[PDB]
Amino acid sequence: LKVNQDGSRVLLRDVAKIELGGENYDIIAEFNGQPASGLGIKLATGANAL
Amino acid sequence: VDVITAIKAQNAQVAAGQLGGTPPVKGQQLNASIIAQTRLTSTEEFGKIL
């Protein structure tokens, strides 16, 4: 991000935490109290559910 | 060109964010949407563009 006039080099980790998180944090899913995810599949119009 | 730039700068919608947005701290109690610069509404506002 910056090179200091002294000589030290400023990195992204020096001003922020870098991690693998999530695009969004709004939806949180639990199954019987355990952490979980899932898929709300919807049926296509005029399709056989079975 | 200056008029166009001033109009574009001072008449715009800016995404601001959200108070207490996810991911929140362990004790967050309030969640509110932040409102910021919005489009102008009247000829008076446009005339006041600097």
Whether A24 sits inside 8 A of B22 (CB atoms) is yes
- What is the structure's resolution, reported in angstroms to one decimal? 2.6
CA distance A1 to A11: 6
Distance from CA of A14 to the nearest CA of B (A): 21
- The b-or-e profile of A9-41 (16+ CB within 10 A means b, else e) is eeeeeeeeeeeeeeeeeeeeeeeeeeeeeeeee
Structure tokens at A39: 């898929």
Contact B21, B28 (CB under 8 A): no
Contact A12, A21 (CB under 8 A): no
Residues of B with CB under 8 A from a CB of A: 22-23
**DSSP of A15-44, one letter per residue?**
TS------S--S--EEETTEEE------PP
Torsion, CA B3, CA B8, CA B11, CA B12, rounded to 10:
180
Contact B32, B21 (CB under 8 A): no
